Design a protein around this ligand. Structure first.
Ligand code: NA
Ligand code: NA
Ligand code: NA
Ligand code: NA
Lengths: 409, 204
């Protein structure tokens, strides 16, 4: 607990840019693309007001559009007079991927017709298209193979406080060990993280801060309409914050919280608000109506685990279950606790052979061990109970491929 | 119930079945079978023939049966076992876990086949476990898989009885003969004996 993330002071003009959404749609062969930027403002509305979205490729200015506020007619009452959408054309765009993180710079300027800048906001833009088609998860038209891992924001000395250095370190290690994706288990990550994954090249699963695995049944809260509000905000506020990052390719509704109506409601919300990304959720059996991807956790390669209500089918058998057609990517597999990862090769053998077995996310990146000191003042790795904490869950907080200090296992 | 149509000897295998000039001859071997046996309850599936690639004629005749008799599914392994001329993925000799990526007409692991992008049909091998001589090894693996996968609904072993003929030596004693044993040539050795039982119905 406490204030574990940066505290800032931001000054905005009275007449300001209150929000902007960046979208990129392409033709079938990705030779052309249209960048669409919806901009919303606050303050005094005036005709002399203008918004100019310009796309930059390095020092070059690939495209630029300007227009006054006043959106298109959306219903019988008219439209948003406090909004405007710019659409820029882009020929032969440099596509973004974890392989080649090609980025552009989108600069949103709030100004007056006579050319006076009021304020400007910006973001990195990555031209990439994510879509599930014919049972396959496609990134720019090609079917992905997620070589991912789950990563908790953990520091052996700073607790759950992140810093650029620790982040960049992890990212390098990951890419160095042939990883291309990460799952923000199990909450939105520190803002800098997305920026790094954007530039370094990593597919990200942005996951809402919602886990109630302790309830009984697991969906006692998520199915209760009384809790729809609290959940709603943990999903919607994540989307409104990170929706512009190209590294974010999938939205997750949270973790271990059974499958309640609330999940379905929020699932549909994201789909309405942001069609650009698939939504997934493993709760309730990994293949519920609240997920676009069959995302089990720890489902074995050939062996079935016929648990009642929420069985874990052999990933290979799962894909062909009557009626099923979705792509399957484990949200968690290969529990790397201690001397583990045995049978890991079997998973990949299968991933490569089955078109719709598109990978998974190992569990997990780093050991959640904390540093304590003995009488002599020497440091040592501590876990469950080592702090008088009780009840505690022994050493189950150490499931990483690397030790708290990022030393490989 | 399978129509009398096999042209495996042609090159490519569908040289005749894709030629409209042969649509008539084929048509009659399909339609006359249906008109004859369509009332038998034991007949649950109609087959368009065997080893004859995949020509337009197959598609035409496929649709005919579907129009004439909606009560039964139609199947055909020609052209890759999953063509537009079959309601069932019916490969022949496709292995359980191992793929055999032949060009044009590969034989995917039956388990991998069911989940291929877009695929949704049920899979029943029209021929598997070639029981030629001391064979049927790995048979248990097929069943292990049939039971675990809902859409892996079985198959048809190949085959029932040895196609051996009886000849007699100088003394007048009978013995089982096969390819070539009748001066027949060219012949294909003993490949006519692939049964689970000998010509005289004695179990193997
Ligand atoms: Na695959
Ligand atoms: Na854990
Ligand atoms: Na079955
Ligand atoms: Na034979």
């Amino acid at each position: 607990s406490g204030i574990f993330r940066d505290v800032s002071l931001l000054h905005k003009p009275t007449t300001q840019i209150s929000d902007f959404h960046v979208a990129t749609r392409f033709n079938d062969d990705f030779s052309r693309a249209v960048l669409e930027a919806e901009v919303q403002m606050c303050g005094e509305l005036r005709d002399y007001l203008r918004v100019t979205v310009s796309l930059w490729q390095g020092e070059t200015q690939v495209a630029s559009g300007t227009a006054p506020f006043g959106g298109e007619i959306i219903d019988e009452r008219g439209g948003y007079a406090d909004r405007v959408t710019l659409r820029l054309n882009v020929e032969n765009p440099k596509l973004w991927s974890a392989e080649i993180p090609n980025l552009y710079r989108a600069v949103v300027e709030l100004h007056t017709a006579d050319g006076t800048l009021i304020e400007a906001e910006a973001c990195d833009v990555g031209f990439r298209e994510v879509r599930i088609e014919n049972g396959l998860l496609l990134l720019n038209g090609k079917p992905l193979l997620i070589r991912g891992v789950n990563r908790h924001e953990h520091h052996p000395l700073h607790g759950q406080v992140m810093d650029e250095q620790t982040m960049v370190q992890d990212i390098l290690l990951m890419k160095q060990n042939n990883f291309n994706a990460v799952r923000c288990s199990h909450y939105p990550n520190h803002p800098l993280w997305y920026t790094l994954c954007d530039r370094y090249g990593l597919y990200v699963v942005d996951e809402a801060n919602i886990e109630t695995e302790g309830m009984v049944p697991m969906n006692r809260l998520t199915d209760d309409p009384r809790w729809l509000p609290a959940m709603s905000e943990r999903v919607t506020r994540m989307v409104q914050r990170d929706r512009n990052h190209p590294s974010v390719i999938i939205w997750s509704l949270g973790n271990e919280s059974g499958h309640g109506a609330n999940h379905d409601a929020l699932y549909r919300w994201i789909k309405s608000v942001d069609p650009s990304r698939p939504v997934q959720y493993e709760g309730g059996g990994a293949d519920t109506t609240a997920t676009d991807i069959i995302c089990p956790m720890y489902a074995r390669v050939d062996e079935d685990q016929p648990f009642p209500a929420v069985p874990k089918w052999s990933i290979k058998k799962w894909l062909s279950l009557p009626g099923e057609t979705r792509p399957l990517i484990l949200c968690e597999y290969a529990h790397a606790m201690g001397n583990s990862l045995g049978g890991f090769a079997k998973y990949w053998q299968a991933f490569r052979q089955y078109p719709r077995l598109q990978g998974g996310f190992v569990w997990d990146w780093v050991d959640q061990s904390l540093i304590k000191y003995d009488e002599n003042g020497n440091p040592w790795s501590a876990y469950g109970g080592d702090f008088g904490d009780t009840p505690n869950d022994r050493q189950f907080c150490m499931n990483g491929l690397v030790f708290a200090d990022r030393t490989p296992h």
